[PDB]
Structure formats: structure tokens, C-alpha cells
Amino acid sequence: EAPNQALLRILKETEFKKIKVLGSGAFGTVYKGLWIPEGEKVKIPVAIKELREATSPKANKEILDEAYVMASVDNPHVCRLLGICLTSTVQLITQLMPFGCLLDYVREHKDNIGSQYLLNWCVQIAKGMNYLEDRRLVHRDLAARNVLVKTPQHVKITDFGLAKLLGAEVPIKWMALESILHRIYTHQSDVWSYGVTVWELMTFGSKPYDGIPASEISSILEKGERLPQPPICTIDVYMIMVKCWMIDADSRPKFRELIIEFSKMARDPQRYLVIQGDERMHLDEEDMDDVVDADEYLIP
Numbered sequence: 001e002a003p004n005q006a007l008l009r010i011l012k013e014t015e016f017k018k019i020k021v022l023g024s025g026a027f028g029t030v031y032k033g034l035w036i037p038e039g040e041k042v043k044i045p046v047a048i049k050e051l052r053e054a055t056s057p058k059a060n061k062e063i064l065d066e067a068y069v070m071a072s073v074d075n076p077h078v079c080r081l082l083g084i085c086l087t088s089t090v091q092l093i094t095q096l097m098p099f100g101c102l103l104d105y106v107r108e109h110k111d112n113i114g115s116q117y118l119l120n121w122c123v124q125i126a127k128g129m130n131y132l133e134d135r136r137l138v139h140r141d142l143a144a145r146n147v148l149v150k151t152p153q154h155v156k157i158t159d160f161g162l163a164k165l166l167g168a169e170v171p172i173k174w175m176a177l178e179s180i181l182h183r184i185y186t187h188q189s190d191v192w193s194y195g196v197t198v199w200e201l202m203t204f205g206s207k208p209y210d211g212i213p214a215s216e217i218s219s220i221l222e223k224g225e226r227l228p229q230p231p232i233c234t235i236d237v238y239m240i241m242v243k244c245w246m247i248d249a250d251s252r253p254k255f256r257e258l259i260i261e262f263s264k265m266a267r268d269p270q271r272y273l274v275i276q277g278d279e280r281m282h283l284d285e286e287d288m289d290d291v292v293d294a295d296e297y298l299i300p
């Protein structure tokens, strides 16, 4: 195994000025602010994950594990960790993804989202996940909700609190069968989740096996049932989703194939997704002359 010489950066607290919450509840409190790497004269829009203040030795492990992963990836379609802050509870700082999670985005923008964007998105996650495969990380929690929007043309995967190395040693509806029955997890289990995610976006944000309670899923799937073809979907596309849902995992597409196949489709997107009124579809404060995007903020 290669050594991991990622650098973990430790950020002071005087180094950044929070400016509004975004996501309390569930587990923590994703805020949003601005990071001014002192002695640089740049401000970086950032989000900051200071999970539920309660500093129970439990969750400090879960978050440093996240950070460990995030510090160690580096690729345009995956969210990298900028640094962490060690204040009382551990804050996780990262490039702000201003337009939120891809799920909310589709749900909130149905009547304006084109095939070109839908397909492009799939291209981008397939890339993000292939990068993770190159680095041998099994994501284990791919979902619309864990993909973020930097701009409508630029999504990036996220949430690695469950990420792991292939070989090493709970969201039912996104999980490959062999994961539900025998907690086996591969890049090919990720591909299934990809299929489910793709199905999420084609349905503008539906909920997979809406209704069906989790305990039944394992049976439903063994029976041979899958998610239905969404309306806008050509058979060519539904066929990819379904190929992601084959029992014999080796028979599922590889992410590099998915990058390829959707990429083909994205050149002529109207032939692959039939959307009403496709052709006609189009998708900050005080001092900011110094703002630079994390993606443009690099270090040696």
C-alpha cells in the first residue's frame, strides 16, 4: 500500500468568521462563513461542520474519520476538506457549495432542469466515484443527498462518514443486495447506489421504494423487483439504471463505463431524456473584492 501524505491543516478560530447556520438538527449544525487564511488576503466561502456541541468521545472519532478521508481525496468531483479546527468540539471546514445538496436542488427546481444538466450530473458523479475507485475508497453512502452543487453545472460528491478501503472491515434503499444480506461492500456495491441516485435525479427527487418499509426491501429485491422507469426516461437510460441493479455485481457497469456511456448521451441529450419544454430552459454581501473559491485556493 502507498503511504498517505495528505496534509491535514489546522485552522485557528480567529481565522474565520461564521455567518449563519444552514443545517442544524439531525446530528450537528452545518454553518456557513468565510475563511481568511491570515497572511494571505483572500476570503474563502466555506461551510463548517461543528456537529452537535456535546463532545462525546464517540462522535469525535466519527468526524476525524470523515476528515481523514476528505483530506486524502483530491479531484474536481469530490469535496475536499480545507482544514479542521480544534476548539472544544471539532469543526470540519470545507469549500461552501452555495446551491445546497443535489436532492433539494432537483426537488426545488423540477420545472427548469434540462436533460443536458441531468445527464451532465450523472457524468460528474460517475467521475467522482471513479476517482474514489482509483484511490480504492468504497463510499458506502452515495445518494442524491450526498452530492453537492457548486453551481448548477458543477456537482461534487460528499459525506464520507462511511467511506472505507476496499478489502477492509443504515440507508436501505440505496444498498446493493449483497450489502443488505451479507454486509458485503464493493465499488460494485457503490455502482448500485449510483443507479439509485441516478434514479433519484431522473424522477426529480422522488423517494425510492416510497412506501415500502425497510425490512421488506431485501425480499422485494430477491423477488426481482426494481425501481420503475421514470417518465422522462428513454429505455436506453433506464437500462443503465437496471444494469446497475443486477444481482451479479461483476455484471454491473464500472464507473469508467458509466462515465463513458452518459458522456455519449450527454452529446445529444434530447434523444435520451424526454422533458416537456426542454429547449427553453435556463438555470454575496458588503465587501467581497477579495473572495476566491476553494477550487482556486491552492497550497504547496
Ligand SMILES: COc1cc2ncnc(Nc3ccc(F)c(Cl)c3)c2cc1OCCCN1CCOCC1
Residues within 6 Å of the ligand: 022, 023, 024, 025, 030, 046, 047, 048, 049, 066, 092, 093, 094, 095, 096, 097, 098, 099, 100, 101, 148, 158, 159
Ligand atoms: C447551502 O447548503 C449547503 C451548502 C453546503 N456547502 C458545503 N458543504 C455542505 N455540507 C457539508 C457536508 C459534509 C461535510 F463534511 C461538510 Cl464539512 C459540509 C453544505 C451543506 C448545505 O446544506 C445542507 C442541507 C440543509 N438542510 C436544511 C434543513 O436542516 C437540515 C439541513
